[PDB]
């Protein structure tokens, strides 16, 4: 939203862990990711790209 990003280097695919775990708990959402991705309509990256519009995680310290 607020024009201003830094995007630092990141090797760990923490995201994968989230999007992955989420799928399990959300067996219904998966169907969508497929009907779209498995349908060769869009790219997996795109799916989540929007999926995570607000869903954010809290900080530690």
PDB file of N, CA and C in Angstrom:
ATOM      1  N   UNK A   1       0.806  -1.206   0.000  1.00  0.00           N
ATOM      2  CA  UNK A   1       0.000   0.000   0.000  1.00  0.00           C
ATOM      3  C   UNK A   1       0.842   1.260   0.000  1.00  0.00           C
ATOM      4  N   UNK A   2       1.401   1.597   1.158  1.00  0.00           N
ATOM      5  CA  UNK A   2       2.230   2.790   1.289  1.00  0.00           C
ATOM      6  C   UNK A   2       3.524   2.642   0.496  1.00  0.00           C
ATOM      7  N   UNK A   3       3.585   3.305  -0.654  1.00  0.00           N
ATOM      8  CA  UNK A   3       4.764   3.246  -1.510  1.00  0.00           C
ATOM      9  C   UNK A   3       6.042   3.290  -0.677  1.00  0.00           C
ATOM     10  N   UNK A   4       6.696   2.140  -0.547  1.00  0.00           N
ATOM     11  CA  UNK A   4       7.924   2.068   0.224  1.00  0.00           C
ATOM     12  C   UNK A   4       8.285   0.647   0.607  1.00  0.00           C
ATOM     13  N   UNK A   5       9.234   0.063  -0.118  1.00  0.00           N
ATOM     14  CA  UNK A   5       9.667  -1.304   0.147  1.00  0.00           C
ATOM     15  C   UNK A   5      11.189  -1.404   0.131  1.00  0.00           C
ATOM     16  N   UNK A   6      11.709  -2.509   0.656  1.00  0.00           N
ATOM     17  CA  UNK A   6      13.149  -2.727   0.706  1.00  0.00           C
ATOM     18  C   UNK A   6      13.509  -4.113   0.178  1.00  0.00           C
ATOM     19  N   UNK A   7      12.612  -5.071   0.393  1.00  0.00           N
ATOM     20  CA  UNK A   7      12.851  -6.427  -0.067  1.00  0.00           C
ATOM     21  C   UNK A   7      14.302  -6.841   0.077  1.00  0.00           C
ATOM     22  N   UNK A   8      14.643  -7.408   1.229  1.00  0.00           N
ATOM     23  CA  UNK A   8      16.008  -7.848   1.491  1.00  0.00           C
ATOM     24  C   UNK A   8      16.223  -9.275   1.000  1.00  0.00           C
ATOM     25  N   UNK A   9      17.485  -9.688   0.930  1.00  0.00           N
ATOM     26  CA  UNK A   9      17.828 -11.030   0.477  1.00  0.00           C
ATOM     27  C   UNK A   9      17.235 -12.085   1.405  1.00  0.00           C
ATOM     28  N   UNK A  10      16.735 -13.168   0.820  1.00  0.00           N
ATOM     29  CA  UNK A  10      16.141 -14.250   1.595  1.00  0.00           C
ATOM     30  C   UNK A  10      16.355 -15.596   0.906  1.00  0.00           C
ATOM     31  N   UNK A  11      16.969 -16.531   1.624  1.00  0.00           N
ATOM     32  CA  UNK A  11      17.234 -17.858   1.083  1.00  0.00           C
ATOM     33  C   UNK A  11      16.173 -18.854   1.540  1.00  0.00           C
ATOM     34  N   UNK A  12      15.835 -18.804   2.825  1.00  0.00           N
ATOM     35  CA  UNK A  12      14.831 -19.699   3.386  1.00  0.00           C
ATOM     36  C   UNK A  12      13.478 -19.499   2.712  1.00  0.00           C
ATOM     37  N   UNK A  13      12.779 -20.600   2.461  1.00  0.00           N
ATOM     38  CA  UNK A  13      11.470 -20.546   1.818  1.00  0.00           C
ATOM     39  C   UNK A  13      10.353 -20.646   2.852  1.00  0.00           C
ATOM     40  N   UNK A  14      10.505 -19.921   3.954  1.00  0.00           N
ATOM     41  CA  UNK A  14       9.509 -19.924   5.018  1.00  0.00           C
ATOM     42  C   UNK A  14       8.097 -19.921   4.442  1.00  0.00           C
ATOM     43  N   UNK A  15       7.876 -19.081   3.436  1.00  0.00           N
ATOM     44  CA  UNK A  15       6.568 -18.982   2.798  1.00  0.00           C
ATOM     45  C   UNK A  15       6.024 -20.366   2.457  1.00  0.00           C
ATOM     46  N   UNK A  16       6.830 -21.157   1.758  1.00  0.00           N
ATOM     47  CA  UNK A  16       6.428 -22.505   1.367  1.00  0.00           C
ATOM     48  C   UNK A  16       5.810 -23.252   2.544  1.00  0.00           C
ATOM     49  N   UNK A  17       6.485 -23.203   3.689  1.00  0.00           N
ATOM     50  CA  UNK A  17       5.999 -23.875   4.890  1.00  0.00           C
ATOM     51  C   UNK A  17       4.579 -23.431   5.225  1.00  0.00           C
ATOM     52  N   UNK A  18       4.331 -22.129   5.117  1.00  0.00           N
ATOM     53  CA  UNK A  18       3.014 -21.576   5.410  1.00  0.00           C
ATOM     54  C   UNK A  18       1.985 -22.051   4.389  1.00  0.00           C
ATOM     55  N   UNK A  19       2.168 -21.642   3.138  1.00  0.00           N
ATOM     56  CA  UNK A  19       1.258 -22.024   2.066  1.00  0.00           C
ATOM     57  C   UNK A  19       1.011 -23.530   2.073  1.00  0.00           C
ATOM     58  N   UNK A  20       2.028 -24.289   2.469  1.00  0.00           N
ATOM     59  CA  UNK A  20       1.921 -25.742   2.520  1.00  0.00           C
ATOM     60  C   UNK A  20       1.023 -26.181   3.674  1.00  0.00           C
ATOM     61  N   UNK A  21       1.397 -25.792   4.888  1.00  0.00           N
ATOM     62  CA  UNK A  21       0.627 -26.145   6.074  1.00  0.00           C
ATOM     63  C   UNK A  21      -0.826 -25.700   5.932  1.00  0.00           C
ATOM     64  N   UNK A  22      -1.021 -24.493   5.411  1.00  0.00           N
ATOM     65  CA  UNK A  22      -2.361 -23.950   5.221  1.00  0.00           C
ATOM     66  C   UNK A  22      -3.217 -24.896   4.386  1.00  0.00           C
ATOM     67  N   UNK A  23      -2.670 -25.346   3.261  1.00  0.00           N
ATOM     68  CA  UNK A  23      -3.384 -26.257   2.374  1.00  0.00           C
ATOM     69  C   UNK A  23      -3.980 -27.424   3.155  1.00  0.00           C
ATOM     70  N   UNK A  24      -3.146 -28.079   3.956  1.00  0.00           N
ATOM     71  CA  UNK A  24      -3.591 -29.213   4.759  1.00  0.00           C
ATOM     72  C   UNK A  24      -4.854 -28.865   5.539  1.00  0.00           C
ATOM     73  N   UNK A  25      -4.753 -27.858   6.400  1.00  0.00           N
ATOM     74  CA  UNK A  25      -5.889 -27.428   7.208  1.00  0.00           C
ATOM     75  C   UNK A  25      -7.053 -26.993   6.322  1.00  0.00           C
ATOM     76  N   UNK A  26      -6.729 -26.408   5.175  1.00  0.00           N
ATOM     77  CA  UNK A  26      -7.746 -25.947   4.238  1.00  0.00           C
ATOM     78  C   UNK A  26      -7.788 -26.835   2.998  1.00  0.00           C
ATOM     79  N   UNK A  27      -8.468 -27.985   3.117  1.00  0.00           N
ATOM     80  CA  UNK A  27      -8.598 -28.945   2.018  1.00  0.00           C
ATOM     81  C   UNK A  27      -9.487 -28.422   0.893  1.00  0.00           C
ATOM     82  N   UNK A  28     -10.344 -27.460   1.222  1.00  0.00           N
ATOM     83  CA  UNK A  28     -11.247 -26.873   0.239  1.00  0.00           C
ATOM     84  C   UNK A  28     -10.521 -25.863  -0.641  1.00  0.00           C
ATOM     85  N   UNK A  29      -9.645 -25.073  -0.028  1.00  0.00           N
ATOM     86  CA  UNK A  29      -8.883 -24.065  -0.757  1.00  0.00           C
ATOM     87  C   UNK A  29      -8.008 -24.711  -1.825  1.00  0.00           C
ATOM     88  N   UNK A  30      -7.460 -25.879  -1.507  1.00  0.00           N
ATOM     89  CA  UNK A  30      -6.602 -26.602  -2.440  1.00  0.00           C
ATOM     90  C   UNK A  30      -7.293 -26.776  -3.789  1.00  0.00           C
ATOM     91  N   UNK A  31      -8.547 -27.213  -3.753  1.00  0.00           N
ATOM     92  CA  UNK A  31      -9.318 -27.423  -4.972  1.00  0.00           C
ATOM     93  C   UNK A  31      -9.166 -26.240  -5.923  1.00  0.00           C
ATOM     94  N   UNK A  32      -9.231 -25.033  -5.373  1.00  0.00           N
ATOM     95  CA  UNK A  32      -9.100 -23.820  -6.172  1.00  0.00           C
ATOM     96  C   UNK A  32      -7.715 -23.731  -6.804  1.00  0.00           C
ATOM     97  N   UNK A  33      -6.683 -23.835  -5.974  1.00  0.00           N
ATOM     98  CA  UNK A  33      -5.307 -23.766  -6.450  1.00  0.00           C
ATOM     99  C   UNK A  33      -5.091 -24.712  -7.629  1.00  0.00           C
ATOM    100  N   UNK A  34      -5.779 -25.848  -7.601  1.00  0.00           N
ATOM    101  CA  UNK A  34      -5.665 -26.837  -8.665  1.00  0.00           C
ATOM    102  C   UNK A  34      -6.453 -26.404  -9.898  1.00  0.00           C
ATOM    103  N   UNK A  35      -7.771 -26.317  -9.751  1.00  0.00           N
ATOM    104  CA  UNK A  35      -8.637 -25.910 -10.851  1.00  0.00           C
ATOM    105  C   UNK A  35      -8.021 -24.751 -11.628  1.00  0.00           C
ATOM    106  N   UNK A  36      -7.157 -23.993 -10.963  1.00  0.00           N
ATOM    107  CA  UNK A  36      -6.498 -22.852 -11.591  1.00  0.00           C
ATOM    108  C   UNK A  36      -5.097 -23.225 -12.065  1.00  0.00           C
ATOM    109  N   UNK A  37      -4.255 -23.652 -11.129  1.00  0.00           N
ATOM    110  CA  UNK A  37      -2.888 -24.043 -11.451  1.00  0.00           C
ATOM    111  C   UNK A  37      -2.862 -25.342 -12.250  1.00  0.00           C
ATOM    112  N   UNK A  38      -3.524 -26.367 -11.724  1.00  0.00           N
ATOM    113  CA  UNK A  38      -3.577 -27.664 -12.387  1.00  0.00           C
ATOM    114  C   UNK A  38      -4.262 -27.558 -13.745  1.00  0.00           C
ATOM    115  N   UNK A  39      -4.944 -26.440 -13.972  1.00  0.00           N
ATOM    116  CA  UNK A  39      -5.647 -26.215 -15.230  1.00  0.00           C
ATOM    117  C   UNK A  39      -4.754 -25.487 -16.230  1.00  0.00           C
ATOM    118  N   UNK A  40      -3.509 -25.243 -15.832  1.00  0.00           N
ATOM    119  CA  UNK A  40      -2.555 -24.554 -16.692  1.00  0.00           C
ATOM    120  C   UNK A  40      -3.056 -23.158 -17.054  1.00  0.00           C
ATOM    121  N   UNK A  41      -3.818 -22.556 -16.146  1.00  0.00           N
ATOM    122  CA  UNK A  41      -4.360 -21.221 -16.369  1.00  0.00           C
ATOM    123  C   UNK A  41      -3.451 -20.152 -15.774  1.00  0.00           C
ATOM    124  N   UNK A  42      -2.943 -20.416 -14.574  1.00  0.00           N
ATOM    125  CA  UNK A  42      -2.058 -19.477 -13.897  1.00  0.00           C
ATOM    126  C   UNK A  42      -0.879 -20.200 -13.254  1.00  0.00           C
ATOM    127  N   UNK A  43       0.060 -19.427 -12.715  1.00  0.00           N
ATOM    128  CA  UNK A  43       1.239 -19.993 -12.071  1.00  0.00           C
ATOM    129  C   UNK A  43       1.055 -20.050 -10.557  1.00  0.00           C
ATOM    130  N   UNK A  44       1.563 -21.115  -9.946  1.00  0.00           N
ATOM    131  CA  UNK A  44       1.458 -21.289  -8.502  1.00  0.00           C
ATOM    132  C   UNK A  44       1.769 -19.990  -7.768  1.00  0.00           C
ATOM    133  N   UNK A  45       2.828 -19.310  -8.200  1.00  0.00           N
ATOM    134  CA  UNK A  45       3.231 -18.053  -7.580  1.00  0.00           C
ATOM    135  C   UNK A  45       2.087 -17.043  -7.604  1.00  0.00           C
ATOM    136  N   UNK A  46       1.387 -16.977  -8.732  1.00  0.00           N
ATOM    137  CA  UNK A  46       0.269 -16.053  -8.884  1.00  0.00           C
ATOM    138  C   UNK A  46      -0.830 -16.356  -7.870  1.00  0.00           C
ATOM    139  N   UNK A  47      -1.212 -17.626  -7.783  1.00  0.00           N
ATOM    140  CA  UNK A  47      -2.254 -18.049  -6.855  1.00  0.00           C
ATOM    141  C   UNK A  47      -2.051 -17.412  -5.483  1.00  0.00           C
ATOM    142  N   UNK A  48      -0.953 -17.771  -4.827  1.00  0.00           N
ATOM    143  CA  UNK A  48      -0.642 -17.234  -3.507  1.00  0.00           C
ATOM    144  C   UNK A  48      -0.457 -15.722  -3.563  1.00  0.00           C
ATOM    145  N   UNK A  49       0.210 -15.250  -4.611  1.00  0.00           N
ATOM    146  CA  UNK A  49       0.452 -13.824  -4.783  1.00  0.00           C
ATOM    147  C   UNK A  49      -0.724 -13.001  -4.269  1.00  0.00           C
ATOM    148  N   UNK A  50      -1.928 -13.370  -4.693  1.00  0.00           N
ATOM    149  CA  UNK A  50      -3.135 -12.665  -4.276  1.00  0.00           C
ATOM    150  C   UNK A  50      -3.703 -13.269  -2.995  1.00  0.00           C
ATOM    151  N   UNK A  51      -3.695 -14.596  -2.919  1.00  0.00           N
ATOM    152  CA  UNK A  51      -4.210 -15.297  -1.748  1.00  0.00           C
ATOM    153  C   UNK A  51      -3.842 -14.556  -0.466  1.00  0.00           C
ATOM    154  N   UNK A  52      -2.575 -14.172  -0.354  1.00  0.00           N
ATOM    155  CA  UNK A  52      -2.094 -13.456   0.823  1.00  0.00           C
ATOM    156  C   UNK A  52      -2.231 -11.948   0.637  1.00  0.00           C
ATOM    157  N   UNK A  53      -3.461 -11.454   0.733  1.00  0.00           N
ATOM    158  CA  UNK A  53      -3.726 -10.028   0.577  1.00  0.00           C
ATOM    159  C   UNK A  53      -3.500  -9.285   1.890  1.00  0.00           C
ATOM    160  N   UNK A  54      -3.908  -9.906   2.992  1.00  0.00           N
ATOM    161  CA  UNK A  54      -3.748  -9.305   4.312  1.00  0.00           C
ATOM    162  C   UNK A  54      -3.101 -10.282   5.286  1.00  0.00           C
ATOM    163  N   UNK A  55      -3.438 -11.561   5.145  1.00  0.00           N
ATOM    164  CA  UNK A  55      -2.890 -12.596   6.013  1.00  0.00           C
ATOM    165  C   UNK A  55      -1.414 -12.341   6.299  1.00  0.00           C
ATOM    166  N   UNK A  56      -1.118 -11.915   7.523  1.00  0.00           N
ATOM    167  CA  UNK A  56       0.255 -11.631   7.923  1.00  0.00           C
ATOM    168  C   UNK A  56       0.561 -12.244   9.286  1.00  0.00           C
ATOM    169  N   UNK A  57       1.843 -12.477   9.549  1.00  0.00           N
ATOM    170  CA  UNK A  57       2.247 -13.058  10.816  1.00  0.00           C
ATOM    171  C   UNK A  57       2.846 -12.033  11.759  1.00  0.00           C
ATOM    172  N   UNK A  58       2.614 -12.220  13.066  1.00  0.00           N
ATOM    173  CA  UNK A  58       3.126 -11.314  14.098  1.00  0.00           C
ATOM    174  C   UNK A  58       4.640 -11.407  14.253  1.00  0.00           C
ATOM    175  N   UNK A  59       5.212 -10.474  15.008  1.00  0.00           N
ATOM    176  CA  UNK A  59       6.652 -10.449  15.233  1.00  0.00           C
ATOM    177  C   UNK A  59       7.019 -11.226  16.494  1.00  0.00           C
ATOM    178  N   UNK A  60       8.317 -11.402  16.717  1.00  0.00           N
ATOM    179  CA  UNK A  60       8.801 -12.130  17.884  1.00  0.00           C
ATOM    180  C   UNK A  60       9.130 -11.171  19.025  1.00  0.00           C
ATOM    181  N   UNK A  61      10.031 -10.231  18.757  1.00  0.00           N
ATOM    182  CA  UNK A  61      10.419  -9.267  19.770  1.00  0.00           C
ATOM    183  C   UNK A  61       9.786  -7.907  19.549  1.00  0.00           C
TER     184      UNK A  61
END
